[PDB]
Amino acid sequence: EGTWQHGYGVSSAYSNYHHGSKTHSATVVNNNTGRQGKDTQRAGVWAKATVGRNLTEKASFYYNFW
């Protein structure tokens, strides 16, 4: 439906999701130090979220559309 690009810079968490049909939001939580981000936008935009940045760690990537 869109373009999802999730990665992990072994230290931080980033999530970029594009959408040109309906609203979309990219949420990413850093489960290590207690970080959290989100880049909510409308239709036609690049939602890039970022959080954390230190060393290897887990993260929670979420997304949606409306």
Side-chain angles (χ1 to χ4, degrees):
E1 38 285 284
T3 306
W4 194 43
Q5 253 321 284
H6 114 106
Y8 221 138
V10 38
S11 258
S12 10
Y14 78 72
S15 224
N16 316 332
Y17 216 141
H18 181 265
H19 225 283
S21 16
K22 86 174 89 317
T23 296
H24 58 296
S25 75
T27 317
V28 57
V29 178
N30 197 15
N31 202 3
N32 168 238
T33 66
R35 230 94 249 195
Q36 94 80 2
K38 52 109 180 169
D39 285 51
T40 300
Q41 309 293 9
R42 66 263 224 169
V45 86
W46 268 97
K48 327 222 245 134
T50 256
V51 264
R53 161 44 134 168
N54 259 133
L55 196 52
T56 42
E57 46 204 307
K58 290 285 233 96
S60 7
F61 311 96
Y62 310 122
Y63 36 29
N64 268 126
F65 341 93
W66 70 83

XYZ file of all heavy atoms in Angstrom:
524
model
N 0.830 -1.192 0.000
C 0.000 0.000 0.000
C 0.874 1.256 0.000
O 0.491 2.283 -0.557
C -0.959 0.000 1.192
C -0.282 -0.569 2.442
C -0.148 -2.090 2.348
O -1.237 -2.747 2.565
O 0.949 -2.601 2.082
N 2.032 1.131 0.632
C 2.964 2.243 0.713
C 4.411 1.748 0.705
O 4.700 0.672 0.185
N 5.283 2.558 1.288
C 6.693 2.215 1.356
C 7.178 2.231 2.806
O 7.277 3.292 3.420
C 7.458 3.182 0.450
O 6.807 3.064 -0.812
C 8.890 2.718 0.174
N 7.467 1.042 3.314
C 7.938 0.905 4.682
C 9.443 0.633 4.638
O 9.914 -0.140 3.805
C 7.155 -0.178 5.426
C 7.346 -0.152 6.944
C 7.362 0.915 7.755
C 7.546 -1.293 7.805
N 7.559 0.547 9.070
C 7.674 -0.838 9.102
C 7.617 -2.663 7.498
C 7.881 -1.688 10.195
C 7.824 -3.499 8.601
C 7.955 -3.058 9.913
N 10.156 1.283 5.547
C 11.598 1.120 5.622
C 12.061 1.162 7.079
O 12.425 2.221 7.589
C 12.314 2.185 4.788
C 12.910 1.577 3.517
C 13.507 0.196 3.797
O 14.574 0.058 4.372
N 12.760 -0.814 3.360
N 12.032 -0.003 7.710
C 12.444 -0.113 9.099
C 13.880 -0.639 9.168
O 14.255 -1.532 8.410
C 11.458 -0.973 9.892
C 12.040 -2.275 10.388
N 12.376 -2.489 11.713
C 12.341 -3.427 9.724
C 12.858 -3.717 11.830
N 12.836 -4.298 10.596
N 14.643 -0.064 10.086
C 16.028 -0.464 10.264
C 16.453 -0.332 11.729
O 15.655 -0.039 12.616
N 17.747 -0.559 11.963
C 18.306 -0.476 13.297
C 19.798 -0.183 13.214
O 20.556 -1.068 12.820
C 18.053 -1.787 14.036
C 17.646 -1.598 15.477
C 16.618 -2.377 16.023
C 18.296 -0.645 16.270
C 16.240 -2.202 17.360
C 17.920 -0.469 17.606
C 16.892 -1.248 18.152
O 16.524 -1.078 19.454
N 20.185 1.030 13.581
C 21.586 1.411 13.539
C 22.320 0.944 14.799
O 23.090 1.700 15.389
N 22.055 -0.299 15.172
C 22.679 -0.876 16.350
C 23.031 0.241 17.335
O 24.203 0.562 17.522
C 23.892 -1.716 15.942
C 24.656 -1.053 14.793
C 24.811 -1.970 17.137
N 21.993 0.803 17.937
C 22.177 1.878 18.897
C 20.912 2.736 18.972
O 20.540 3.207 20.045
C 23.384 2.743 18.530
O 24.519 2.446 19.339
N 20.286 2.911 17.817
C 19.070 3.704 17.738
C 18.031 2.983 16.878
O 18.331 1.962 16.260
C 19.357 5.095 17.169
O 20.678 5.197 16.644
N 16.829 3.542 16.866
C 15.743 2.965 16.093
C 15.107 4.053 15.224
O 14.815 5.158 15.674
C 14.734 2.310 17.038
N 14.899 3.708 13.952
C 14.305 4.626 13.001
C 13.264 3.899 12.162
O 13.436 2.709 11.901
C 15.400 5.214 12.114
C 15.867 4.274 11.029
C 15.040 4.003 9.933
C 17.128 3.671 11.121
C 15.473 3.132 8.927
C 17.561 2.799 10.115
C 16.734 2.529 9.018
O 17.157 1.681 8.037
N 12.222 4.612 11.762
C 11.170 4.014 10.956
C 10.572 5.062 10.015
O 9.994 6.049 10.467
C 10.077 3.408 11.839
O 9.672 2.121 11.379
N 10.731 4.809 8.724
C 10.213 5.719 7.715
C 9.154 4.998 6.880
O 9.382 3.930 6.317
C 11.324 6.184 6.772
C 12.592 6.541 7.550
O 12.552 6.933 8.705
N 13.715 6.386 6.855
N 7.972 5.615 6.813
C 6.863 5.060 6.063
C 6.223 6.147 5.209
O 5.861 7.191 5.748
C 5.846 4.462 7.029
C 5.174 3.216 6.503
C 4.902 2.149 7.367
C 4.823 3.129 5.149
C 4.279 0.995 6.879
C 4.200 1.974 4.662
C 3.929 0.907 5.526
O 3.321 -0.219 5.051
N 6.097 5.887 3.916
C 5.499 6.855 3.013
C 4.066 6.434 2.683
O 3.734 5.250 2.743
C 6.365 7.042 1.766
C 5.818 8.050 0.783
N 5.040 7.691 -0.305
C 5.942 9.408 0.737
C 4.719 8.791 -0.970
N 5.279 9.854 -0.323
N 3.255 7.424 2.339
C 1.865 7.170 1.999
C 1.288 8.381 1.265
O 1.413 9.513 1.731
C 1.062 6.793 3.245
C 0.146 5.608 3.050
N -1.059 5.695 2.375
C 0.272 4.309 3.447
C -1.624 4.497 2.373
N -0.798 3.640 3.039
N 0.667 8.102 0.128
C 0.069 9.155 -0.676
C -1.383 8.822 -1.022
O -1.844 9.109 -2.127
N -2.066 8.223 -0.057
C -3.457 7.849 -0.246
C -4.295 8.333 0.939
O -5.326 8.977 0.753
C -3.602 6.335 -0.414
O -2.436 5.636 0.013
N -3.820 8.005 2.132
C -4.513 8.398 3.348
C -3.485 8.718 4.434
O -2.315 8.359 4.312
C -5.527 7.329 3.755
C -4.864 6.237 4.597
C -5.904 5.254 5.139
C -6.133 4.103 4.156
N -6.210 4.613 2.769
N -3.959 9.390 5.473
C -3.094 9.762 6.581
C -2.307 8.547 7.074
O -2.754 7.411 6.927
C -3.965 10.402 7.664
O -4.467 11.587 7.052
C -3.143 10.915 8.849
N -1.146 8.828 7.649
C -0.292 7.772 8.164
C 0.565 8.318 9.309
O 0.822 9.518 9.379
C 0.544 7.152 7.042
C 1.419 8.143 6.310
N 0.906 9.194 5.571
C 2.776 8.230 6.213
C 1.918 9.876 5.055
N 3.077 9.277 5.455
N 0.983 7.408 10.178
C 1.803 7.784 11.316
C 2.768 6.649 11.662
O 2.376 5.483 11.691
C 0.938 8.132 12.529
O 0.383 6.971 13.141
N 4.013 7.028 11.914
C 5.037 6.056 12.257
C 5.477 6.273 13.706
O 5.943 7.354 14.062
C 6.201 6.173 11.270
N 5.312 5.228 14.504
C 5.684 5.292 15.907
C 6.780 4.269 16.213
O 6.711 3.126 15.764
C 4.418 5.094 16.742
O 3.442 5.901 16.089
C 4.536 5.708 18.139
N 7.767 4.717 16.976
C 8.876 3.855 17.347
C 9.240 4.103 18.813
O 9.472 5.242 19.215
C 10.053 4.076 16.394
C 10.485 5.544 16.388
C 11.226 3.161 16.749
N 9.278 3.018 19.571
C 9.609 3.102 20.983
C 10.958 2.424 21.229
O 11.229 1.358 20.679
C 8.478 2.505 21.823
C 8.825 2.537 23.313
C 7.155 3.223 21.552
N 11.768 3.071 22.054
C 13.083 2.542 22.378
C 13.018 1.813 23.721
O 12.906 2.446 24.770
C 14.113 3.667 22.500
C 15.539 3.116 22.425
O 15.774 1.985 22.031
N 16.473 3.974 22.823
N 13.092 0.492 23.645
C 13.042 -0.330 24.842
C 14.467 -0.619 25.316
O 15.008 -1.692 25.052
C 12.356 -1.669 24.563
C 11.821 -2.292 25.854
O 11.901 -1.719 26.928
N 11.273 -3.491 25.689
N 15.036 0.357 26.009
C 16.389 0.221 26.521
C 16.621 1.265 27.615
O 16.939 0.919 28.752
C 17.422 0.454 25.419
C 18.825 0.614 26.006
O 19.495 1.616 25.817
N 19.232 -0.427 26.727
N 16.455 2.524 27.234
C 16.644 3.621 28.167
C 15.305 4.289 28.482
O 15.193 5.038 29.451
C 17.676 4.579 27.568
O 17.028 5.111 26.416
C 18.896 3.848 27.005
N 14.321 3.994 27.644
C 12.993 4.558 27.821
C 12.764 5.731 26.865
O 12.490 6.848 27.302
N 12.884 5.436 25.579
C 12.693 6.452 24.558
C 11.440 6.149 23.735
O 10.952 5.021 23.733
C 13.903 6.528 23.624
C 14.387 7.971 23.470
C 15.497 8.287 24.475
N 15.003 9.245 25.490
C 15.803 9.936 26.329
N 17.144 9.783 26.281
N 15.255 10.765 27.198
N 10.954 7.177 23.054
C 9.767 7.035 22.229
C 9.635 8.226 21.277
O 9.938 9.359 21.651
C 8.513 6.884 23.093
C 7.843 8.239 23.329
C 7.001 8.651 22.120
O 6.888 7.937 21.137
N 6.418 9.840 22.248
N 9.186 7.929 20.067
C 9.010 8.961 19.060
C 7.797 8.666 18.178
O 7.134 7.643 18.347
N 7.541 9.580 17.253
C 6.418 9.431 16.344
C 6.354 10.646 15.415
O 6.575 11.775 15.849
C 5.125 9.185 17.124
C 4.919 10.257 18.197
C 3.766 11.191 17.823
C 3.566 12.268 18.891
N 2.646 13.319 18.401
N 6.049 10.373 14.155
C 5.953 11.428 13.162
C 4.641 11.279 12.390
O 4.615 10.685 11.313
C 7.105 11.347 12.159
C 8.459 11.824 12.688
O 8.819 11.304 13.813
O 9.137 12.649 12.057
N 3.584 11.828 12.970
C 2.272 11.763 12.349
C 2.152 12.814 11.243
O 2.528 13.968 11.435
C 1.220 11.918 13.450
O 1.475 10.825 14.328
C -0.201 11.664 12.942
N 1.628 12.374 10.108
C 1.454 13.261 8.971
C 0.222 12.852 8.162
O -0.373 11.806 8.415
C 2.707 13.277 8.092
C 3.959 13.554 8.927
C 3.934 14.973 9.499
O 2.942 15.680 9.429
N 5.076 15.347 10.068
N -0.125 13.698 7.204
C -1.276 13.439 6.355
C -0.854 12.649 5.115
O 0.275 12.168 5.035
C -1.944 14.744 5.918
C -1.016 15.559 5.016
C -0.272 16.630 5.818
N -0.281 17.912 5.081
C 0.093 19.095 5.615
N 0.507 19.167 6.897
N 0.045 20.180 4.864
N -1.784 12.540 4.177
C -1.522 11.816 2.945
C -0.536 12.615 2.089
O -0.741 13.802 1.845
C -2.842 11.552 2.219
N 0.514 11.930 1.659
C 1.532 12.560 0.837
C 2.615 13.204 1.703
O 2.668 14.427 1.832
N 3.454 12.352 2.276
C 4.533 12.823 3.127
C 5.362 11.627 3.601
O 4.915 10.485 3.513
C 3.966 13.652 4.281
C 3.564 12.756 5.453
C 4.962 14.725 4.726
N 6.553 11.931 4.094
C 7.448 10.896 4.582
C 7.500 10.996 6.107
O 8.011 11.972 6.652
C 8.827 11.009 3.928
C 8.987 10.165 2.663
C 8.856 10.556 1.387
C 9.315 8.760 2.602
N 9.075 9.511 0.513
C 9.362 8.385 1.274
C 9.562 7.838 3.634
C 9.656 7.081 0.857
C 9.854 6.540 3.200
C 9.906 6.145 1.869
N 6.962 9.972 6.755
C 6.941 9.932 8.207
C 8.166 9.168 8.711
O 8.195 7.939 8.672
C 5.628 9.307 8.682
N 9.150 9.927 9.172
C 10.375 9.336 9.682
C 10.468 9.587 11.189
O 10.539 10.734 11.628
C 11.584 9.850 8.899
C 11.218 10.117 7.437
C 12.318 9.625 6.496
C 12.973 10.793 5.757
N 14.446 10.659 5.777
N 10.463 8.495 11.939
C 10.546 8.581 13.388
C 11.913 8.072 13.847
O 12.499 7.196 13.213
C 9.390 7.796 14.012
N 12.382 8.642 14.948
C 13.670 8.257 15.500
C 13.638 8.331 17.028
O 12.941 9.169 17.598
C 14.741 9.150 14.870
O 15.377 8.307 13.913
C 15.857 9.508 15.853
N 14.403 7.443 17.647
C 14.471 7.397 19.098
C 15.606 6.463 19.521
O 15.849 5.443 18.877
C 13.114 6.987 19.673
C 12.297 8.216 20.080
C 12.338 6.118 18.681
N 16.272 6.843 20.602
C 17.375 6.052 21.118
C 18.681 6.396 20.398
O 18.704 7.272 19.534
N 19.734 5.689 20.780
C 21.040 5.909 20.182
C 22.138 5.777 21.240
O 22.450 6.738 21.939
C 21.125 7.295 19.539
C 22.582 7.715 19.333
C 23.413 6.557 18.777
N 24.252 7.031 17.654
C 25.263 6.318 17.111
N 25.567 5.092 17.585
N 25.948 6.840 16.111
N 22.693 4.576 21.323
C 23.748 4.306 22.283
C 24.485 3.027 21.878
O 25.621 3.082 21.410
C 23.176 4.097 23.687
C 23.340 5.357 24.539
O 22.425 5.811 25.204
N 24.556 5.894 24.481
N 23.807 1.905 22.073
C 24.383 0.615 21.734
C 23.257 -0.393 21.486
O 22.095 -0.113 21.777
C 25.377 0.172 22.810
C 26.323 -0.966 22.422
C 27.035 -0.662 21.102
C 27.311 -1.267 23.550
N 23.642 -1.541 20.951
C 22.680 -2.590 20.660
C 21.510 -2.529 21.644
O 21.714 -2.384 22.848
C 23.420 -3.929 20.679
O 24.291 -3.829 21.802
C 24.366 -4.092 19.487
N 20.310 -2.643 21.095
C 19.107 -2.602 21.909
C 17.880 -2.944 21.062
O 17.951 -2.949 19.835
C 18.947 -1.238 22.582
C 19.194 -0.102 21.586
C 19.609 1.181 22.308
O 18.817 1.554 23.255
O 20.641 1.779 21.967
N 16.783 -3.221 21.752
C 15.541 -3.562 21.078
C 14.718 -2.292 20.860
O 15.042 -1.237 21.403
C 14.797 -4.654 21.848
C 15.536 -5.991 21.756
C 15.342 -6.632 20.381
C 14.823 -8.066 20.511
N 13.349 -8.097 20.389
N 13.666 -2.436 20.067
C 12.793 -1.313 19.771
C 11.451 -1.838 19.257
O 11.366 -2.965 18.772
C 13.479 -0.382 18.767
N 10.436 -0.994 19.380
C 9.102 -1.359 18.934
C 8.647 -0.416 17.818
O 8.488 0.783 18.040
C 8.106 -1.329 20.094
O 8.689 -0.809 21.286
N 8.449 -0.994 16.643
C 8.016 -0.219 15.492
C 6.529 -0.441 15.210
O 6.052 -1.564 15.062
C 8.828 -0.709 14.291
C 10.335 -0.780 14.547
C 10.907 -1.957 14.916
C 11.102 0.334 14.404
C 12.306 -2.023 15.153
C 12.501 0.268 14.641
C 13.073 -0.909 15.011
N 5.796 0.672 15.140
C 4.370 0.633 14.882
C 4.030 1.556 13.721
O 4.809 2.442 13.379
C 3.615 1.046 16.143
C 4.059 0.306 17.381
C 4.547 1.018 18.484
C 3.981 -1.091 17.428
C 4.958 0.331 19.632
C 4.392 -1.777 18.577
C 4.880 -1.066 19.679
O 5.280 -1.735 20.799
N 2.859 1.347 13.115
C 2.424 2.160 11.997
C 0.917 2.027 11.817
O 0.309 1.203 12.497
C 3.159 1.720 10.734
C 3.412 0.233 10.670
C 2.539 -0.655 11.310
C 4.522 -0.260 9.972
C 2.775 -2.034 11.253
C 4.757 -1.637 9.914
C 3.884 -2.525 10.555
O 4.114 -3.868 10.498
N 0.354 2.826 10.923
C -1.077 2.779 10.675
C -1.430 3.774 9.568
O -0.552 4.443 9.026
C -1.865 3.167 11.928
C -2.226 1.929 12.753
O -1.936 1.832 13.934
N -2.872 0.991 12.067
N -2.719 3.840 9.266
C -3.199 4.742 8.233
C -4.693 5.026 8.404
O -5.434 4.187 8.914
C -2.977 4.044 6.890
C -1.957 2.904 6.943
C -2.373 1.628 7.159
C -0.633 3.168 6.774
C -1.427 0.570 7.209
C 0.314 2.110 6.822
C -0.103 0.834 7.039
N -5.091 6.213 7.969
C -6.483 6.618 8.069
C -6.665 7.889 7.238
O -7.719 8.098 6.639
C -6.900 6.794 9.531
C -6.266 8.005 10.217
C -6.673 9.281 10.181
C -5.087 8.002 11.049
N -5.847 10.097 10.925
C -4.851 9.295 11.470
C -4.246 6.942 11.433
C -3.778 9.648 12.298
C -3.179 7.312 12.260
C -2.928 8.609 12.693
